[PDB]
Write an enzyme that holds these catalytic residues in place. Structure first.
Site, mmCIF file in Angstrom:
data_model
loop_
_atom_site.group_PDB
_atom_site.id
_atom_site.type_symbol
_atom_site.label_atom_id
_atom_site.label_comp_id
_atom_site.label_asym_id
_atom_site.label_seq_id
_atom_site.Cartn_x
_atom_site.Cartn_y
_atom_site.Cartn_z
ATOM 1 N N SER A 116 32.678 -30.780 37.920
ATOM 2 C CA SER A 116 31.415 -30.110 37.617
ATOM 3 C C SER A 116 30.997 -29.144 38.708
ATOM 4 C CB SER A 116 30.303 -31.110 37.259
ATOM 5 O OG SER A 116 30.008 -32.003 38.307
ATOM 6 N N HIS A 132 22.936 -29.576 38.693
ATOM 7 C CA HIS A 132 23.015 -31.040 38.703
ATOM 8 C C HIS A 132 23.765 -31.588 39.916
ATOM 9 C CE1 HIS A 132 27.039 -30.622 36.602
ATOM 10 N NE2 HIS A 132 27.329 -31.662 37.359
ATOM 11 N N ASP A 153 21.588 -25.183 33.751
ATOM 12 C CA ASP A 153 22.272 -25.927 34.806
ATOM 13 C C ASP A 153 22.977 -24.911 35.706
ATOM 14 O OD1 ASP A 153 23.323 -28.080 36.210
ATOM 15 O OD2 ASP A 153 24.848 -28.551 34.727
#
EC number: 3.4.21.5
Lengths: 13, 278
Positions: B226, B72, B128
């Protein structure tokens, strides 16, 4: 979720 | 490099322990975090943007030429994000968030980006994960060193509810920005509890971590974190293993909510396949 900085000299890019 | 993986130059190699690793070992059977020690996470990488010089995500060093991150961070159509090799650079060996750490950090250019073919951005960020090949190999040092990728047995014994892992990053401290790398240790949570906390369909390629409302303690990853590593120290061989990648969460440190992480081991065959062909 979901995803102040001093510039980087030309010692890489 | 990968035979000396997970052994930190400033800690394991010198027989020195960091301030909170005992907390992890005692459980075996960034919001609300703290400043990391120098050399505490030598595999931590900063995914950086070239255009507006900005921090995008965290990432991790798995070898001299490979960096692991969340897909992502590179591709997320809902927000019009689709980065290519030339839009980014990685900064390895950092501690300070904003400062260009002269003589300490190293900057590398990307040669190729590999996103999992079945990455599900349309629904729940299933799979992901993304790999990035550095244009030139990075030299290890006291502040730069790769983390280990888990094997079946390590995943089996370590990935258990209640066992604590560690998340590190330069992301937001609340749902401002930290001056240096932050660290928080969080317990792995039972799958039923993870499922029952959200309307999002969770898959086997994810796991959630964090404290329950009644546990008192708090902590979570947040924007900017992230793509970063969720690691655990094996009590059998004393090496650090990356069990997860900071994936998604509903807000940061919200009561009753948990941070979700990409299950690294379940996607290991894809990793090996990519590295064995490219």
């Amino acid at each position: 979720r979901x995803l102040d900085y001093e510039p980087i000299p030309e010692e890489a890019a | 490099g990968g035979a000396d993986c997970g052994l930190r130059p400033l800690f394991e190699k010198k027989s020195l322990e960091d301030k909170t690793e005992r907390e992890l070992l005692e459980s075996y059977i960034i919001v609300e975090g703290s400043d990391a020690e120098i050399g505490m996470s030598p595999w931590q990488v900063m995914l950086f943007r070239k255009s507006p010089q900005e921090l995008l995500c965290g990432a991790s060093l798995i070898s001299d030429r490979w960096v692991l991150t969340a897909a992502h961070c590179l591709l997320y159509p809902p927000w019009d994000k689709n980065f290519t090799e030339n839009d980014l650079l990685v900064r390895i060996g950092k501690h300070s968030r904003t400062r260009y750490e002269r003589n300490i950090e190293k900057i590398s250019m990307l040669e190729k980006i590999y996103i999992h073919p079945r990455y599900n951005w349309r629904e729940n960020l299933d799979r992901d994960i993304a790999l990035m090949k550095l244009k030139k190999p990075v030299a290890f040092s006291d502040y730069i060193h790769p983390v280990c990728l888990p094997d079946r047995e390590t995943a089996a014994s370590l990935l258990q509810a209640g066992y604590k892992g560690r998340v590190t990053g330069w992301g937001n401290l609340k749902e401002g920005q930290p001056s240096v790398l932050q660290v928080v240790n969080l317990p792995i949570v039972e799958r039923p509890v993870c499922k029952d906390s959200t309307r999002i369909r969770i898959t086997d390629n994810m796991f959630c971590a964090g404290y329950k409302p009644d546990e008192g303690k708090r902590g979570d990853a947040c924007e900017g974190d992230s793509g970063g590593p969720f690691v655990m120290k094996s009590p059998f061989n004393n090496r650090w293993y990356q069990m997860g990648i900071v994936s998604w969460g509903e807000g940061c440190d919200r009561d009753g909510k948990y941070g979700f992480y990409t299950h690294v081991f379940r996607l290991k065959k894809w990793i090996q396949k990519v590295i064995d062909q490219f």
